[PDB]
Amino acid sequence: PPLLLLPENVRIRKYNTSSEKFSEYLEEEEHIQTIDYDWDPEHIGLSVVYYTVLAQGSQFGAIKRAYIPNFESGSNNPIREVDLGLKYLMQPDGLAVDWVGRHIYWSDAKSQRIEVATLDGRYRKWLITTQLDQPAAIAVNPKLGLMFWTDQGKQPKIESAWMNGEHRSVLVSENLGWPNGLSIDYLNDDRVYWSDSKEDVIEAIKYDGTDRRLIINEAMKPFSLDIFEDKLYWVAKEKGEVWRQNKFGKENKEKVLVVNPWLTQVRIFHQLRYNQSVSNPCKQVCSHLCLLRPGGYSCACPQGSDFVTGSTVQCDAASELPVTMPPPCRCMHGGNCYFDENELPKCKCSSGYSGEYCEVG
Amino acid sequence: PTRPPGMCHLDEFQCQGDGTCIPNTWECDGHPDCIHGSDEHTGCVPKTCGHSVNTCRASQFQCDNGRCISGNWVCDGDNDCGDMSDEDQRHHCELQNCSSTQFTCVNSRPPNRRCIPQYWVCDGDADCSDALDELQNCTMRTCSAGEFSCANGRCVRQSFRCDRRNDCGDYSDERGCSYPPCHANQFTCQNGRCIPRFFVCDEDNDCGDGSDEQEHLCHTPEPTCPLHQFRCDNGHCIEMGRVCNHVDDCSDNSDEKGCGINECLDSSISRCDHNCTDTITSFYCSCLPGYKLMSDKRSCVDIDECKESPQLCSQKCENVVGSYICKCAPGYIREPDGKSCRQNSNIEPYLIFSNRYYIRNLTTDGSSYSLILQGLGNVVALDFDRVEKRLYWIDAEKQIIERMFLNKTNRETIINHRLRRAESLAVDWVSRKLYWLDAILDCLFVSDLEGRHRKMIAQHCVDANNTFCFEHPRGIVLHPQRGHVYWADWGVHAYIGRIGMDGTNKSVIISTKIEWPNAITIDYTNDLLYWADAHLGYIEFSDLEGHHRHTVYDGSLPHPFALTIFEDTVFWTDWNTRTVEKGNKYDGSGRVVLVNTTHKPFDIHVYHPYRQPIMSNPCGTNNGGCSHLCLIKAGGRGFTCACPDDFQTVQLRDRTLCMPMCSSTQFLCGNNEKCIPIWWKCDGQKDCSDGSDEPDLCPHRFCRLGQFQCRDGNCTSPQALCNARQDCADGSDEDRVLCEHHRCESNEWQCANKRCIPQSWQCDSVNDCLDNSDEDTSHCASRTCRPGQFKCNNGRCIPQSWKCDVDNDCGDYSDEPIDECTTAAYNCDNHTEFSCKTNYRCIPQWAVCNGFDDCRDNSDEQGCESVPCHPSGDFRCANHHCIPLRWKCDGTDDCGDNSDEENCVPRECSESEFRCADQQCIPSRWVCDQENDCGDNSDERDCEMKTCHPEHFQCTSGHCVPKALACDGRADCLDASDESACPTRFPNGTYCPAAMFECKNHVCIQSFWICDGENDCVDGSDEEIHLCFNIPCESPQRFRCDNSRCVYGHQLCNGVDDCGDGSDEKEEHCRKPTHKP
Amino acid sequence: XXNXX
């Protein structure tokens, strides 16, 4: 069964769609916007989620990453966060993660740009920074090598391009209000979905931009979308409720959760959503960045930097070493986590459970 | 040698008709060489080849009207004659000792000084002017608890409180009082007197100021009988059929008494000069065009069409008897219509106008609009130089005057010292000088075009009554042909002054109907003065002596600040509409708005070689031999030497001798060029030309540029020198030798202990100089207030405008003499000031409806819903106030009810501004300057990826810092990068002077900063604990902790530990150990 | 006032 992720202004709550009960997660945070996850990149059993934050006044926004258990449940684990070191963010309304490679995509709304870098945010470089007013959420389709982004200002538009910033195009520009969330149906011929905070409708269209359809209407101000199995997810911003409906728009609107208005997004935590089986087309020939494109790949340099003269691979910018990740608490099946003098996450097994990290028993 | 563009050689006649140059000797030769005969003009030299009247009895006084009265009743206190003949001073009612009970009753004014035979002296009652009879030889008394209690005066009834009457003898019953508004029966005089309507225009001054009998109500025009009816004698609008019709109805037959034959067929009656109009019942003389009806109503006088009305012809007018001729000035071509003049030089004009942050290049027609310079601080006034193609300006945010060629190269500051608030400037292109005005020192200066040889040439007041003084000087123009300097002033007594260019012959030009004269200029062809007023809203021109004013625009101008004239069009800068406009220079027709501006445009100038006419330099090639300033004498006919601001002018028989006299705290240059302040000495900046400013025996400098250095190495601001406060550790700023000959500027007054204070605080009842010299009675008595300021008996000085202010200024009410203030001598300035309804205060008119009680009785703020706002340059608030349109959407609540800020659409940023995240504009130089300027550091965002300004150094963290701050020995970058990469300063490999501690990241701090508990230098070398293992700290207050750190003071007993083990919050020191039980 | 540069 898929796991639901719901980030609030102060805390992040995960809800099981089958167990129908909540569980403890990261706490003691302020002004976060959106989350995204990567399915256990190290194949250990802890997936990595990327939650971005914004700040008020003097302090700037930032992006942080944290671990999440992949097993049935986990509690009392002291989840520790780490700041990516990405400075100069006002409000990251859009954020997405690419599992094919180690790149992260996020658009700073006030900076009217779309920023990419490594998973630890070292080789920052702007994709496109022109003809934007209010860059909304970002979606990525690595299989077809196409990203998606929208603007919700005086010129509401939905646009797609390659992951290296070229071949920019606009999908539709008519009968659009205030787009807020984007979603791609990875199984239905890469069909894309989006919402509207003004028209209060959810519409679908193909990746190339043909056969625009009105799926559902009167959704009570949807904010973000998520498609899993054969159903569509959305959250009413002004009320905080979560609803489900058939992705073909031929079913009643079911009710699941009622949450406070601080709720910002609904995201499904499942491996089948992203299909990690896709291989990496990169040949590891690029010096700093290896972005994706349909039918191949390309090399990129950090922002404001140029390649060495005569060459199109090596960048003049310096190369910095990656950043390690602190170990998580892998205590399983109702275990507890403890830190010794070495500060290693040494678990404390409960009654009837033995072994390292308390598996089985 | 070539003729200057469009003109002719210094010896060559130029034909007005077509501009070609004709030989000089061909002028007035009897042959019309020029194409229109302009070389044989009118001014060319010719060729020769009781018992009697009023006397009833010698013992009876004779009244002036013929009446007879007894002579023993003269000067008894009552007007027995009825025409004041018996009480007339000229009838010897003065200069005599009034005898016995008939006291003199000492007073100035005659009517209340009458020597009444008072037998009730000392009874306890006020009996004449000042009631001194109760003080001649009298006794004290104690007040009854019911009546009013005059302190100086007698204890009199409560009806005397606030009744327009002096009862205590010193108006103490009227001090602090108010007045209920006069009723319908009582007309309110301008000074606050309630007078019954029986006395209005009764030919008697009842109010005391003559307001009741002013001509506004005492005209009463007589009937006119317009056409279709006929007037005979006094207003009889009888039918024209009643003209000479033998019926005496026209008063005493006014038309039958004449109506004879034509009286102008002969000189026996009419004697009219030019023409005759004999008509019904009478005749009248009249004159041909070109002649004015003279005041004698008999003859004709030739009109001076040039001086009386310069509007008739464009550039220069020559009067002729009964007509006029207008010639164009050298360099202009006269159009075939005979009036219009066209510029002949092929150089085309273009406006240079001084926007905030920019110097702009605007073409006259409005087609082009470019930038000359950008990124300036705040340019309030500029002026050009034609000879070297330079461009001088003021920068009020930096207090400097710069210069630069017109091709944008060789920018250079020429003045940076002692310039408080420079308001305007002009360039003396003839004798190479620079004139400027400052509002704080309130003076007119002069300097060499290069900055050297500054001098003061006008201060204090301008006139022989100190009625007009430098208060807020602004705007200045030059007339080097006549050697004059003109400058405006918008103080309380707003005026336009004039002076020669060496300080002599200062005078007032315009002093009436002038409130806010922001601008001034001269049309060099007409020799016509020009100015504009921001309050009354006009643009007036006049002759150079101030006579014959005329109005271009009448009250339709929102707010001009700087005007300029070329050919026949005048360009001005308007603050309220934030526009540069243009129109005809006489009537204002053809008004065109050249350009909009996001910031108020301050100055403007037509750049053209004709705007600075070429004329011979008097000091040419020699400076007249003067080693110092060679100024132009008034009248533009000779020169005159001078000396700088701190030299003594001594005259020999044939050569002026200026020698230095500068103070102890001033340094005199080796070749005696000038004197510079002592703190300027020994700083590496070669302030002096000859190099004596920086000797090789100079001690090492620790302080930054501009800071005085104490002998032991400490630093302080320059104002701390000789201020009677020990501001250095050893007090080298208080050394006796530094103060022995201390001096300070004209606007501050020196005390006994050599600390000098502002002149307004002198004798202010508060001890400022610490020695009570400013409040010493001996000096506070003998001293004279500076010109233009009224002096109190208390010793205080006040601006003269504060006499009759109603509010107390001197504390002793010496500034409110009611008797003087209640007459006509202190009326309000008509049609420029607003008069209150109860009090006698006169307030400036623009203070009406401004959100403040100006008239002290809310009269100025009453009925505010009826005053109309300006039709073009005003914004109307919800509370019916009017504000300048420039203050709408500016971001500040100005109306008082946020009317301006409601529905505010954010403005656009200019060429040199950056739009903040929340839609706000800030200077580009504020981007990444190590400070939060956009409210939320959104300017500091993402600048690892941009270069800085050309003159700024960039830290590794992306912030921009001034280059001069690099490698100075002090941490200025956030990461101290500005010192981390640059070499040593000394040959022995040491970084900074040994008198300071050295941190490992090459920034040096003072010795005491070591282990101070704060990361003073970013590397933290000072906070290393091993340093203060060998360094003690101040044991009584500096808590030497267990591990030998010396956490102290405010961070003791705090919420967190600074020593590391919590001893600085331990309940052993904060808790009272003994606390002296 | 309304006349300060």
Ligand SMILES: *[C@@H]1O[C@H](CO)[C@@H](O[C@@H]2O[C@H](CO)[C@@H](O[C@@H]3O[C@H](CO[C@H]4O[C@H](CO)[C@@H](O)[C@H](O)[C@@H]4O)[C@@H](O)[C@H](O[C@H]4O[C@H](CO)[C@@H](O)[C@H](O)[C@@H]4O)[C@@H]3O)[C@H](O)[C@H]2NC(C)=O)[C@H](O)[C@H]1NC(C)=O
């Ligand atoms: C931006 O615009 C400015 C102003 O036009 C230019 O500055 C001028 O540049 C010229 C060319 O370099 C300068 O001309 C040279 O001036 C020298 C100094 O002369 C002084 O005395 C004379 C006479 O009173 C003054 O007119 C002058 O202002 C100086 O005070 C001369 O010694 C030079 O003589 C040499 O050339 C002449 C021919 O021109 C020969 O006859 C001589 O034998 C000798 O070889 C020369 O005349 C001029 O002085 C500059 N202006 C000023 C006021 O200094 C900038 O060049 C221009 N910049 C750019 C980049 O466009």
Ligand SMILES: *[C@@H]1O[C@H](CO)[C@@H](O[C@@H]2O[C@H](CO)[C@@H](O[C@@H]3O[C@H](CO[C@H]4O[C@H](CO)[C@@H](O)[C@H](O)[C@@H]4O)[C@@H](O)[C@H](O[C@H]4O[C@H](CO)[C@@H](O)[C@H](O)[C@@H]4O)[C@@H]3O)[C@H](O)[C@H]2NC(C)=O)[C@H](O)[C@H]1NC(C)=O
């Ligand atoms: C800026 O102003 C500050 C004060 O705010 C000055 O601080 C003084 O600095 C001097 C040194 O420059 C200190 O003098 C030292 O005094 C020690 C004994 O203290 C007595 O005498 C001093 C006056 O000299 C009195 O102030 C004090 O109250 C005591 O009465 C001496 O032991 C020190 O000797 C040093 O040099 C000798 C000879 O090489 C060595 O043998 C010693 O080991 C030692 O290194 C020294 O003379 C003075 O105490 C400080 N006063 C205060 C109140 O702080 C700064 O000096 C000044 N700026 C700079 C950079 O000079």
Ligand SMILES: *[C@@H]1O[C@H](CO)[C@@H](O[C@@H]2O[C@H](CO)[C@@H](O[C@@H]3O[C@H](CO[C@H]4O[C@H](CO)[C@@H](O)[C@H](O)[C@@H]4O)[C@@H](O)[C@H](O[C@H]4O[C@H](CO)[C@@H](O)[C@H](O)[C@@H]4O)[C@@H]3O)[C@H](O)[C@H]2NC(C)=O)[C@H](O)[C@H]1NC(C)=O
């Ligand atoms: C590398 O080189 C620098 C110099 O470039 C060294 O710094 C010098 O250190 C010496 C020794 O401390 C200093 O000499 C002493 O200066 C005292 C203060 O006078 C200075 O400051 C006053 C301020 O008014 C100036 O007027 C004056 O000109 C000086 O600049 C003097 O009072 C000392 O005199 C006393 O000792 C001498 C003997 O040394 C006796 O003959 C005297 O009678 C008296 O008792 C003395 O002159 C010198 O000032 C420092 N110079 C600077 C600029 O720092 C570094 O120490 C050195 N570093 C290393 C580690 O190599």
Ligand SMILES: *[C@@H]1O[C@H](CO)[C@@H](O[C@@H]2O[C@H](CO)[C@@H](O[C@@H]3O[C@H](CO)[C@@H](O)[C@H](O)[C@@H]3O)[C@H](O)[C@H]2NC(C)=O)[C@H](O)[C@H]1NC(C)=O
């Ligand atoms: C008002 O008075 C003026 C001045 O006296 C009168 O001007 C006169 O006008 C007449 C007609 O143009 C002039 O006569 C002419 O003189 C010339 C030259 O001699 C001659 O060639 C013509 O044939 C004609 O006779 C007369 O000279 C002139 N007077 C002067 C002194 O210039 C005017 O007529 C009077 N107008 C009224 C309404 O009274």
Ligand SMILES: *[C@@H]1O[C@H](CO)[C@@H](O[C@@H]2O[C@H](CO)[C@@H](O[C@@H]3O[C@H](CO)[C@@H](O)[C@H](O)[C@@H]3O)[C@H](O)[C@H]2NC(C)=O)[C@H](O)[C@H]1NC(C)=O
């Ligand atoms: C203010 O703006 C005006 C108009 O834009 C500027 O006038 C321009 O001045 C330059 C320099 O003199 C002219 O270039 C020169 O033209 C002459 C004659 O053709 C030629 O001999 C030179 O070799 C050079 O090309 C330019 O033509 C002229 N443009 C116009 C329309 O007048 C003026 O310079 C500006 N002033 C400042 C301080 O920026």
Ligand SMILES: *[C@@H]1O[C@H](CO)[C@@H](O[C@@H]2O[C@H](CO)[C@@H](O)[C@H](O)[C@H]2NC(C)=O)[C@H](O)[C@H]1NC(C)=O
């Ligand atoms: C300068 O001040 C003198 C007074 O010292 C003025 O003279 C007085 O003028 C007023 C009218 O303005 C008269 O009422 C006084 O009678 C005059 N007194 C004397 C003694 O002269 C003088 O008018 C002032 N200057 C100017 C040009 O107004």
Ligand SMILES: *[C@@H]1O[C@H](CO)[C@@H](O[C@@H]2O[C@H](CO)[C@@H](O)[C@H](O)[C@H]2NC(C)=O)[C@H](O)[C@H]1NC(C)=O
């Ligand atoms: C000093 O100033 C006075 C005016 O205050 C000048 O006097 C005027 O001068 C002009 C031109 O000579 C005359 O036409 C006026 O009639 C004068 N008016 C008065 C009231 O004096 C005087 O010329 C100036 N002196 C100098 C040195 O220029």
Ligand SMILES: *[C@@H]1O[C@H](CO)[C@@H](O)[C@H](O)[C@H]1NC(C)=O
């Ligand atoms: C100044 O702005 C107004 C309003 O936008 C506009 O009508 C006017 O044309 C502008 N000025 C000029 C000379 O273009």
Ligand SMILES: *[C@@H]1O[C@H](CO)[C@@H](O)[C@H](O)[C@H]1NC(C)=O
């Ligand atoms: C005074 O002001 C009035 C307008 O209120 C004006 O008509 C008159 O000309 C002015 N002059 C004087 C002093 O009467």
Ligand SMILES: *[C@H]1O[C@H](CO)[C@H](O)[C@H](O)[C@H]1NC(C)=O
């Ligand atoms: C001729 O003289 C005039 C006046 O001094 C100008 O300097 C002009 O530039 C000169 N012409 C040439 C060609 O030098």
Ligand SMILES: *[C@H]1O[C@H](CO)[C@H](O)[C@H](O)[C@H]1NC(C)=O
């Ligand atoms: C002109 O010439 C005559 C003689 O024909 C006289 O000398 C007369 O004085 C001269 N006029 C002047 C102004 O010199």
Ligand SMILES: *[C@H]1O[C@H](CO)[C@H](O)[C@H](O)[C@H]1NC(C)=O
């Ligand atoms: C007051 O007047 C005297 C002359 O009587 C001096 O000019 C003195 O300088 C004046 N007062 C001041 C403060 O300058």
Ligand SMILES: *[C@H]1O[C@H](CO)[C@H](O)[C@H](O)[C@H]1NC(C)=O
């Ligand atoms: C770097 O940035 C500054 C500020 O924006 C200026 O634009 C400057 O011209 C830039 N420098 C370069 C070499 O492009």
Ligand SMILES: *[C@H]1O[C@H](CO)[C@H](O)[C@H](O)[C@H]1NC(C)=O
């Ligand atoms: C630092 O500069 C001084 C200047 O006199 C000397 O050149 C010294 O040798 C320099 N130090 C080094 C390490 O080069």
Ligand SMILES: [Ca+2]
């Ligand atoms: Ca001739």
Ligand SMILES: [Ca+2]
């Ligand atoms: Ca009498």
